[PDB]
C-alpha cells in the first residue's frame, strides 16, 4: 500500500483522510516522500490559519533542499503534527500514519470532489 485504498489524493502528492469529526488529516504520499528524501526539519503552519488551496503553508527540509508543501484544499488549519519536531523522519517512515503534517476544516465542497481516489492517484503515478 504505497497507495492506501480509502484515502483521497491531490495533484501535488498529498493525501487526505476524512475523520469522524468531518475534518481532514493531510500528509504527503509515499511517492512524495521518496522524492524528498530524508526529512530533517518541517516548518508547520499556525493552528487556526485560513488557507486557500495552492497556498504554500508548510516547508519540508531535507538534507538537499527546502521543499514547499501546499494546501490541497481551502479551509482552516485545526491541528499540526507536533511529533514532527522531534521525529521529522516519520514523514519518510510512516507517510500515511505518524508522518501526517496537518489537519484541516475544509470550507469548499467542490474542492473535495475534485480530489482523486486511490485508483486515479495510482494512475497519475503511472505516467
Amino acid at each position: 500500500s504505497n497507495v492506501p485504498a480509502e484515502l483521497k489524493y491531490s495533484k501535488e502528492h498529498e493525501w487526505l483522510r476524512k475523520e469522524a469529526d468531518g475534518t481532514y488529516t493531510v500528509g504527503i504520499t509515499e511517492h512524495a516522500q521518496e522524492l524528498l528524501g530524508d526529512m530533517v526539519f518541517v516548518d508547520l503552519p499556525e493552528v487556526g490559519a485560513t488557507v486557500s488551496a495552492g497556498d504554500d503553508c508548510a516547508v519540508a527540509e531535507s538534507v538537499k533542499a527546502a521543499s514547499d508543501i501546499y494546501a490541497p484544499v481551502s479551509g482552516e488549519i485545526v491541528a499540526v503534527n507536533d511529533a514532527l519536531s522531534d521525529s521529522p523522519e516519520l514523514v519518510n517512515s510512516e507517510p500515511y500514519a505518524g508522518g501526517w503534517i496537518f489537519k484541516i476544516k475544509a470550507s469548499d465542497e467542490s474542492e473535495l470532489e475534485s480530489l482523486l481516489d486511490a485508483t486515479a492517484y495510482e494512475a497519475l503515478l503511472e505516467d
Binding site: 528524501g37 530524508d38 526539519f41 538534507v63 523522519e89
Partner: protein, 363 residues
C-alpha cells in the same frame, strides 16, 4: 551521461541514480541518513570508480612530482606510503587536490577526482613531458571505498591469505598491490577503511560480496555529509584556481622545507603567505534550519566594522544534529557570525574547519 559499470549492482541495491559529471551515480539507496549512520558506526561503501588512477614510471618520476606538487613526495620513504597534496597553477591557486602513492624510486601513482579528470590529465601530461615519464591512465580499473569502524574487518573477509598478510596492521595512508587488488588505507569520511581498486570486470562481483559481508551501499548524499563533518575539501567549493591553498585549510599540506625545492606556484604562494590570506573556517548553526552553499557570512569587528565571507559548503550534520558549513572568511572573525538565509540573519558559531573525529563531535 554514461551508465557506470556497476549500474546493475547499484539498481539491485535500490539506487536512486543521478547525473554526476557525466555519469549516472547513486545519490542514495533509500536513506542518505541511514547511509551516514552506517559509516559512522559500522561499515558503508561507495562506488568511486570514476576517480582516475594514473601510474607514473621512469627515473625522473620523483623529481617530476617534487616539482608538480606542493606537498613533497620526498617524505614518502616507505614502500606504499601515500600523501594528500594540492597541485597548484603558476599563480598559487589550486588546480586540484589529489592523493599520491610511492611504490619504488621510479614508480608512483596519483588518484584524481572525476570532475577534474581532463584538466588534470592535460596539466600532468604537459608538465611530465620534459621529465620523460611513462604516464598510464588506468581506466581499466574500478574502485570501491569501504569506510567505517568495521570496514576493514568486513572487507578483509573477502581477501585471500596473501592479501590479508600484505595489509595486516597497515597504517593509514598506505596502498599495496596484492594480486588483482590494490588496497589502500585512505578515505573521504573521517573513519578507518580501505579504498580497493581492481579490474573493471571484477568490480560487480566484488561489490556483491561486500554487500553480503554486511557493508551498506552508500551514495553521494552520504558521501557529502560524512566528508564535510570530517572537514575535507571538495574541489570547486572549498578551493578552485582563484583560491590559494592557504585560504582553503590546505596550509598543513604545503611542504615548505626543504627550502631549495621549487614547485609550481611556490613563488606565488610565498608572496601570498607574506601578504596574508583569508581562511577557511567551520560554522555551526544550532538553531533550526540548514546552511547552504554560497550564502554570505558576516561579522562586525570590535571597531563596529562589518566584514563578509562566504559559505563554500553547507549541509545538515547527522552526527552533530545541527547544520554545519565550511566558509572562507576575512582574517579576524571572532566566535560568532551571521548568515543570511532567505531574509533572516541566522547566528552561527565559528569553529575550526572540522566537526567530527572518531565518530565524536570535536566539541
Amino acid at each position: 551521461a554514461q551508465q557506470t559499470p556497476l549500474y546493475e549492482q547499484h539498481t539491485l541495491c535500490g539506487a536512486r541514480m543521478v547525473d554526476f559529471h557525466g555519469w549516472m551515480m547513486p545519490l542514495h539507496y533509500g536513506s542518505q541518513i541511514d547511509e551516514h549512520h552506517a559509516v559512522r558506526t559500522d561499515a558503508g561503501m561507495f562506488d568511486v570508480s570514476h576517480m582516475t588512477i594514473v601510474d607514473l614510471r621512469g627515473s625522473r618520476t620523483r623529481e617530476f612530482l617534487r616539482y608538480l606538487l606542493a606537498n613533497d613526495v620526498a617524505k614518502l620513504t616507505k614502500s606504499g606510503k601515500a600523501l594528500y597534496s594540492g597541485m597548484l597553477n603558476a599563480s598559487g591557486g589550486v588546480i586540484d587536490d589529489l592523493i599520491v602513492y610511492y611504490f619504488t624510486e621510479d614508480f608512483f601513482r596519483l588518484v584524481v577526482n572525476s570532475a577534474t579528470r581532463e584538466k588534470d590529465l592535460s596539466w600532468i601530461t604537459q608538465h611530465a613531458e620534459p621529465f620523460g615519464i611513462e604516464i598510464t591512465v588506468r581506466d581499466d580499473l574500478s574502485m570501491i571505498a569501504v569506510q567505517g569502524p568495521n570496514a576493514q574487518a568486513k572487507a578483509a573477509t573477502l581477501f585471500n591469505d596473501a592479501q590479508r598478510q600484505a595489509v595486516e596492521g597497515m597504517k593509514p595512508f598506505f596502498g599495496v598491490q596484492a594480486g588483482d587488488l590494490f588496497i589502500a588505507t585512505t578515505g573521504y569520511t573521517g573513519e578507518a577503511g580501505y579504498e580497493i581498486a581492481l579490474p573493471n570486470e571484477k568490480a560487480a562481483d566484488f561489490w556483491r560480496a561486500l554487500v553480503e559481508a554486511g557493508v551498506k551501499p552508500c551514495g553521494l548524499g552520504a558521501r557529502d555529509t560524512l566528508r564535510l563533518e570530517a572537514g575535507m575539501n571538495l574541489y570547486g567549493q572549498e578551493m578552485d584556481e582563484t583560491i590559494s591553498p592557504l585560504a582553503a585549510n590546505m596550509g598543513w599540506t604545503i611542504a615548505w622545507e626543504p627550502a631549495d625545492r621549487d614547485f609550481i606556484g611556490r613563488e606565488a604562494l610565498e608572496v601570498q603567505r607574506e601578504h596574508g590570506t583569508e581562511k577557511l573556517v567551520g560554522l555551526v548553526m544550532t538553531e533550526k534550519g540548514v546552511l547552504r552553499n554560497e550564502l554570505p557570512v558576516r561579522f562586525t569587528d570590535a571597531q563596529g566594522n562589518q566584514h563578509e565571507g562566504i559559505i563554500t559548503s553547507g549541509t545538515f550534520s547527522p552526527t552533530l544534529g545541527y547544520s554545519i558549513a565550511l566558509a572562507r572568511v576575512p582574517e579576524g572573525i571572532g566566535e560568532t557570525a551571521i548568515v543570511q538565509i532567505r531574509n533572516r540573519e541566522m547566528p552561527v558559531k565559528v569553529t575550526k574547519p572540522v566537526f567530527v573525529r572518531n565518530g565524536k563531535a570535536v566539541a
